[PDB]
């Protein structure tokens, strides 16, 4: 009924520490408290019993050791290593592999996290509002160019379109059928997606018959398009994505943000 999957990889995007042979992505002490400490705390808070961490080809026992020693844990965590990983796919290929182990509804939570939010309320929202998928976006750093853009609603709070700025045509484009049902659609500049994902019971059917997703974003939320043609078989409650906004200073790490997180932590 209640399970969580913990994504782990390798520091491909980070610049100046991660290229050393014995230090992993999961175990990174950047601001005193460890990177997977916070995740573990979150999991504990979330009342989730059985949690399994997905591990890459690099580091197989180090993560296990981390899970075991130093740390409160008191839970039956299991560290599993599937073989189909190439990175050129971060976690989609792992997700595709682990599917008969999912008995209920699963939650996706990467190893690299910075958190300050009240966490119960996301879970509760996921449970209540009869929704298949829900994600999170949080404010840009407020302390003293080309960026990223997301779609939002404010009355129900829904998501529709999620595309960035790296690989697209120069002018901004909107579809016709993707407005005539669900009229009001607001676009925001400031928001940073924390990459936290929730998944319902009926999702396992698609990843064993026809894969398309890249970096866990492509064929997940945007294939909600039940308009124009109707040519991809849907699994029945309609295919609908959701999103919620929060205020506190905590976000994703991808670029030069680690050094800023250091500055943040001591408060």
């Amino acid at each position: 009924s209640i399970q969580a999957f913990v994504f782990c990889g390798k520091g491909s995007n980070l610049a100046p520490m991660q290229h050393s042979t014995r230090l992993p992505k999961a175990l990174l002490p950047i601001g005193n408290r460890p990177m997977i400490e916070y995740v573990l705390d979150w999991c504990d808070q979330a009342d989730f019993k059985e949690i399994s961490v997905v591990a890459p080809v690099d580091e197989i026992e180090l993560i296990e050791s981390g899970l075991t020693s130093f740390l409160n844990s008191n839970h039956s965590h299991h560290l599993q290593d599937p073989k189909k990983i190439n990175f050129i796919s971060t976690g989609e290929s792992l997700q595709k592999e682990l599917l008969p182990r999912i008995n209920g509804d699963f939650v996706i939570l990467p190893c690299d996290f910075v958190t300050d939010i009240p966490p119960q309320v996301l879970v509760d929202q996921f449970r209540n509002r009869d929704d298949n998928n829900l994600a999170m976006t949080i404010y840009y750093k407020n302390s003293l160019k080309q960026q990223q853009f997301f779609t939002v609603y404010s009355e129900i709070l829904l998501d529709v379109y999620s595309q960035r700025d790296v690989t697209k045509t120069k002018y901004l484009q909107i579809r016709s059928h993707l407005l005539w049902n669900y009229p009001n659609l607001t676009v925001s500049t400031k928001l940073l997606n924390s990459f936290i994902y929730f998944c319902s019971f009926e999702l396992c059917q698609l990843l064993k018959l026809g894969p398309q997703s890249m970096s866990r974003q492509a064929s997940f939320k945007d294939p909600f398009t039940g308009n124009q043609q109707q040519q991809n078989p849907p699994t029945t409650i309609f295919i609908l994505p959701n999103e919620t906004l929060f205020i506190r200073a905590n976000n994703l790490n991808a670029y030069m943000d680690a050094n800023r997180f250091v500055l943040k932590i001591k408060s």
Binding site: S1, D47, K49, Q120, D124, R127, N128, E155
Partner: protein
């Protein structure tokens, strides 16, 4: 078990017959609690749609699911801790929000069933026949009863009828729908609704979705539509062995008005809604929710606004209480239609021995 007490709102000098709050947002739940019960509790806490009849059905379904999920342990027998579990569940329900007479009856029946089958029969074969029998019971003491109610209504209700109601009683909705589309007639159906809930509104919506001419009504002026109105059903919940109706909202007022102006008021019921417990006023046993339901400026339900309202302790003493369940009278609801077909509420327990 969890967290109890430590909550806002005063004891209230006016009306304190039952306690007022509980568990809404989940943390540190026991490692044996079935999720269906939890979800139901979450629903009921902020529920719009259900009231009396469907709730019981839902509960039954949940119980059936639990039974399906349950198997006889190696150490403890089939009747060892089941009863305890049931009791715990009931206590949780009570903590969440007080319950109905039908529910109690169902619980009693379950208990009886527990006793009936001896702890020696094959375990797989036991629950096989159990779930069948429960299903049968559900069919008979709800669906069959509903059918019977419908048929009762059919013989009595005239060629072309204007029907005025209050609430969200599913039976009545079904009846209305039947009249609209199945047997086919002219139906001017008027529904009334209060401030905190939107039951009436929901019913109207449903009727629209089936295609009916509806009038949407409120408290401030009922009379303006009567002064014409010919036939009226009330929001049935529970009958006592006096001959009254423990029911929802200012239905009593409406009934009084009906009594004053020409026509009797009538009610349909299920032959398991009846109690054997009794009371006689809107002070006896009050059903309460939080005074937070009326802070927001109306229109919709989830809004979040800034204005003036939001004082339960801030200003110099401010109590903003209400009621959900009140007393409907006796001399006026002459009509009752059940699983035993006919009778008066003056004949308050003439089917309670017949069962």
């Amino acid at each position: 078990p969890g967290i109890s007490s430590v909550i806002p709102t005063v004891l209230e000098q006016s009306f304190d017959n039952s306690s007022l709050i509980s568990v809404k947002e989940l943390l540190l739940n026991k490692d044996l609690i079935h999720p269906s019960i939890l979800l139901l509790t979450s629903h009921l806490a902020h529920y719009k749609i259900v009231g009396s009849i469907p709730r019981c059905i839902a509960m039954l379904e949940v119980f059936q699911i639990v039974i399906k999920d349950y198997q006889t342990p190696k150490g403890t027998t089939l009747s060892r801790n089941l009863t305890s579990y049931l009791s715990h569940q009931i206590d949780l329900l009570k903590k969440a929000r007080p319950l109905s007479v039908t529910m109690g009856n169902a619980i009693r029946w379950l208990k009886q069933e527990i006793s009936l089958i001896d702890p020696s029969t094959p375990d797989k074969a036991a629950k096989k026949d159990l779930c069948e029998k429960i299903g049968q019971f559900a069919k008979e003491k709800i669906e069959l009863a509903d059918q019977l109610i419908i048929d009762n209504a059919s013989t009595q209700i005239e060629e072309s009828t204007t029907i005025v109601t209050y609430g969200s009683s599913k039976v009545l909705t079904e009846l209305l729908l039947h009249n609209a589309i199945s047997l086919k007639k002219n139906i001017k159906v008027i529904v009334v609704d209060s401030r905190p809930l939107f039951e009436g509104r929901k019913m109207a919506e449903t009727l629209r979705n089936a295609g009916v001419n509806v009038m949407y009504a409120l408290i401030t002026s009922l009379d303006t539509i009567f002064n014409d109105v010919d036939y009226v059903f009330l929001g049935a919940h529970s009958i006592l062995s006096n001959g009254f109706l423990y029911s929802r909202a200012g239905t009593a007022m409406l009934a009084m008005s009906a009594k004053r102006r020409n026509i009797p008021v009538l009610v349909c019921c299920e032959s398991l809604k009846f109690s054997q417990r009794v009371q006689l006023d809107s002070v006896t046993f009050n059903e309460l929710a939080d005074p937070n339901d009326l802070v927001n400026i109306d229109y919709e339900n989830p809004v979040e606004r800034r204005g003036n309202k939001g004082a339960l302790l801030n200003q110099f003493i401010k109590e903003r209480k209400f009621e959900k369940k009140k007393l409907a009278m006796e001399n006026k609801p002459k009509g009752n239609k059940i699983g035993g077909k006919k009778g008066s509420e003056g004949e308050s327990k003439d089917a309670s021995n017949e069962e």
